[PDB]
Amino acid sequence: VCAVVPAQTILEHSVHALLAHPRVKRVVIAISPGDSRFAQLQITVVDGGDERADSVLAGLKAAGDAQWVLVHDAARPCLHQDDLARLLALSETSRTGGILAAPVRDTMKRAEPGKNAIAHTVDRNGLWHALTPQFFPRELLHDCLTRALNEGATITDEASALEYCGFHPQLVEGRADNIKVTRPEDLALAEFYLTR
Amino acid sequence: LDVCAVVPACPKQYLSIGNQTILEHSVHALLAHPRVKRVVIAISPGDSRFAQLPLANHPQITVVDGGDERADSVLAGLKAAGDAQWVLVHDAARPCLHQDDLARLLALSETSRTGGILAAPVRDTMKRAEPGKNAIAHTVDRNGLWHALTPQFFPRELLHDCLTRALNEGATITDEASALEYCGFHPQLVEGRADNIKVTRPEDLALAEFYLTR
């Protein structure tokens, strides 16, 4: 199984956890133009695209003989091996693949369109926070991404590409601590969280 | 005008983070704002630990018992709201409530007719499951999707009626804002800090403590 990562220095954390696995022979990273940082830090390098989906496909060429691919957010460092394992143990049951997801606990509201008023309460049953890594058959992913990018469909995660093409990925519960740092405070929390 | 806060009924509010219980952290946060004159705390028939808290002898707190249903415990609390025309409904296990957030919320009495609730936007990709299986049915749109938080602020008489109607009609109430929803009312969403959590699981303790730290 190969690992693709569309891209502080969380990156190393995210990767070392991917690598922390035995069944994860190599990690294909991706770097957009104008990126000098990377050279400072089973690792390969590919020239990413403009879209997330571009880079994933970009990295797809370096995947070798892997029939399964693992995509992982560059800003998600609180991933546990117990979670990774629970996830990778899909290739021997999975037809389409699946992703690490976390149940919703609080109650949620959908806003009235174009207004900050509450339209109605959203059902908590079967609602999940999509997380990563994402695990699916190599070529499969590649073809759903191809099609998705072509039909110009809205894509968020790699699961969304498969979904787009009819497929229904699998939901593998993972910890909630496994977060993504996008704000100037998620770091403090991500730090606290990754410290066991 | 004066605001009366109401705390509706294996809960974790009586556990302690530092020298006070979660409940006290929550209540302190409400009393801290000059508009909140009193706090009606609604307890459960089988809860006797509350009478063991200094918070019980506080000039501004009042206890009431409305059973274990929160809609009822809240109706019980309104009876004790005195003259408050607007009511703040807040969870007992939300210790981290911030002042900048509370104020932004109270401003609503002067702006909306239906009140509003604090809430934090959804930042991650959300998936809906296929009925009866851990397989994705389709992706749920996060634009306009929110996490409900408390406090929740409404005019007193409106909340009373909606709760009353919702109960009288078997509505499926979750929070107070969902009873107004059930009544054709659409409360305003005010944005607050996500660190405003509801401590329900043991791992929630450390996190709540990590946030209470400054």
From Swiss-Prot, chain B:
Gene3D superfamilies xref list: Spore Coat Polysaccharide Biosynthesis Protein SpsA, Chain A (3.90.550.10)
CDD domains for the chain: CDP-ME_synthetase
Its EC number(s): 2.7.7.60
Cofactor(s) essential for the protein: Mg(2+); Mn(2+); Co(2+)
Keywords for the protein's UniProt record, in alphabetical order: Cobalt, Isoprene biosynthesis, Magnesium, Manganese, Nucleotidyltransferase, Transferase
GO CC annotations, alphabetized: cytosol
One GO molecular-function entry: identical protein binding
Top-level taxon of origin: Bacteria
UniProt-annotated site: Transition state stabilizer, residues: K12
Catalytic activity as recorded in UniProt: 2-C-methyl-D-erythritol 4-phosphate + CTP + H(+) = 4-CDP-2-C-methyl-D-erythritol + diphosphate
BP-aspect Gene Ontology terms: isopentenyl diphosphate biosynthetic process, methylerythritol 4-phosphate pathway
Site-annotated residues for Positions MEP for the nucleophilic attack: R142, K198
Effect listed in the UniProt record for changing T125I: Loss of activity
Database matches in InterPro entries: IspD (IPR001228), IspD/TarI (IPR034683), IspD/TarI_cytidylyltransf_bact (IPR050088), ISPD_synthase_CS (IPR018294), Nucleotide-diphossugar_trans (IPR029044)
Pathway: Isoprenoid biosynthesis; isopentenyl diphosphate biosynthesis via DXP pathway; isopentenyl diphosphate from 1-deoxy-D-xylulose 5-phosphate: step 2/6
Misc note: There are no coordination bonds that occur between IspD and magnesium in any of the complexes examined to date.
Annotated function: Catalyzes the formation of 4-diphosphocytidyl-2-C-methyl-D-erythritol from CTP and 2-C-methyl-D-erythritol 4-phosphate (MEP).
PANTHER family for this protein: 2-C-METHYL-D-ERYTHRITOL 4-PHOSPHATE CYTIDYLYLTRANSFERASE, CHLOROPLASTIC
Subunit organization: Homodimer.
Family according to the record: Belongs to the IspD/TarI cytidylyltransferase family. IspD subfamily.
Protein name: 2-C-methyl-D-erythritol 4-phosphate cytidylyltransferase
Species assigned in the record: Escherichia coli (strain K12)
Lineage of the organism: Bacteria, Pseudomonadati, Pseudomonadota, Gammaproteobacteria, Enterobacterales
Gene: ispD
